[model samples]
Target: SSVELRVLEARPEDVGRKIVRMDKQTRARLGVSVGDYVEVKKVDRSVVARVLPARPEDVGRGIVRMDKYLRAALGVSVGDYVEVKKVE
Candidate 1:
């Protein structure tokens, strides 16, 4: 399954990491776990990154946090929407 989520800048400590953080609920819905790969897409661009749990405050907010590299690869920035899905 897939879902669209708003993009957020990665936490300072998470910079340079090729991982995306989302709520556990969302992760469960996508059928992915931490360290599993997921595809994040914007328009026709997409990037595969490992999944991580969102910060406690970010849970249930319908947003995903990723580093700038992932954002650039997907052609998106903070506040943009991206489709996320588990990799086969």
Candidate 2:
């Protein structure tokens, strides 16, 4: 199930290269499962972002964490929205 979601910048420590952190609930709801990936897009920018099986307590946040590099390349900011879809 593709959906538009609010994107948030990943913390410096959490930003390892280009990472996308998503909770398990969101991942399942997006049909990404556990080891799959998702393609996140905003206008002309898009990347096949990986899913980070969040800590147990982080579930149900309804938010996605994008590293600074990916976020900047995709021209997305904190609170900015983007479309996310399962990537084959």
Candidate 3:
């Protein structure tokens, strides 16, 4: 399976918008450290992304899944998307 974990951020256009964001505890549970860009796909729109902060609560809620990165290794950064496995 192929997946990407890009350094994405929520479009600034959505200012003052009410969005349910991935919490701080989740980030710790996922083991992602600070400064790492979190991926948050723009709802149904692929053109945009909502990148979560290391501590989203302080920065603002938005980030989504971490599986795209968690499945990979530690050296792998946010922008560095890696292939999980081969279908064969």
Candidate 4:
């Protein structure tokens, strides 16, 4: 199933990693695991990215953390909602 999650700035350590982080619960709900590919969509534009677990403090927040590059690729900014789904 797909989910819409708010965007957040990536942790300094994750910058340029080409990955997106979401809560474990969200990952389970999306049927994705760490290192799996997920499609992040903003309106008609989308990009495939690796998925990773969110920080402990960010669990259950319904947010995805991504670097500026990913945000630019998706044409999104922090607080924008993006559709996320597992990629086969």
Candidate 5:
């Protein structure tokens, strides 16, 4: 299933890295998991990012966070909702 999540900038050191974080429970409900790769699309832009488990130590529920660099690469913003799909 497709879900919309707020885009968040990764930590400074991870800025440019191709990775995304999703809540573990949310991923399970959506039938996804860490290490999976997805195409995050917004507008006319799309970028591939590996899915990683969110590290809130507490659940983030519906949050899917990506690095700022990924944001720039996809030409999207923090508030933008991106379509995520598995890339065969």
Candidate 6:
């Protein structure tokens, strides 16, 4: 089933030219917290920004090592429309 999420923080970063990060603001306006649940969609873009905790599927996708840094954490992969939800 779908879950809820809270938007802790968000920002607009010029990856290089005109790319930026996307976050959940639509639900936050309804009063959500960091421990809340929300959906996470794939940020399909030429420039991917930094991310926090790594996903469990990362290693299965041949990502054995984590660079810890944004540049190294993610390769040159442009994620598709990814979505996720947490417990509300």
Question: Number of the top candidate by TM-score?
Answer: 4
Q: Which residue pairs overlap in candidate 5's backbone?
A: none
Q: Model 1: per-residue lDDT, tens digit, 1-88?
A: 6999999999998999989999999998998888899999888998888898898999899999998888888889799999999776
lDDT of 3 at 23: 49
lDDT of 3 by residue, 1-88 (tens): 2233343233444333322124455445544443343333322322212324433343333333333233232334345433221112
Candidate 5, run of 10 with poorest lDDT: 56-65
lDDT of 5 by residue, 1-88 (tens): 6666767667666666788888877677657788888778887888888888778763765566788778888887877777776764
Locate the minimum summed-lDDT window of 10 residues in model 3: 42-51
lDDT against the true structure, per candidate, is: 0.90, 0.77, 0.34, 0.93, 0.75, 0.29
TM-score of each: 0.94, 0.81, 0.25, 0.95, 0.80, 0.22
Clashing pairs in 6: 4-37, 4-38, 5-36, 5-37, 5-38, 41-82, 42-82
lDDT of 6 by residue, 1-73 (tens): 4222221212223233221222334223424443343334334412232223323343223111112233222
Q: Determine which window of 10 residues in candidate 2 has minimal summed lDDT.
A: 53-62
Output the lDDT of residue 85, model 5. 69
**Which regions in candidate 2 have their CA more than 4 angstroms from the true location?**
none
Cand. 1 TM to true fold: 0.94
Each prediction's number of clashing residue pairs: 0, 0, 3, 0, 0, 7
**Candidate 6: which stretches are off by over 4 Å?**
1-24, 27-31, 35-76
Q: Please, what are the lDDT tens digits per residue for candidate 2 over residues 1-88?
A: 6877788767677786455778866877787775677899999889987777766665676677888788877888888998888875
TM-score of 2: 0.81
The per-prediction CA RMSD against the true structure, in angstroms, equals: 0.9, 1.9, 12.8, 0.9, 1.9, 13.5
Give the residue spans of candidate 3 off by over 4 A: 1-23, 46-88
The TM-score of candidate 3 is 0.25
Clashes of 1: 0
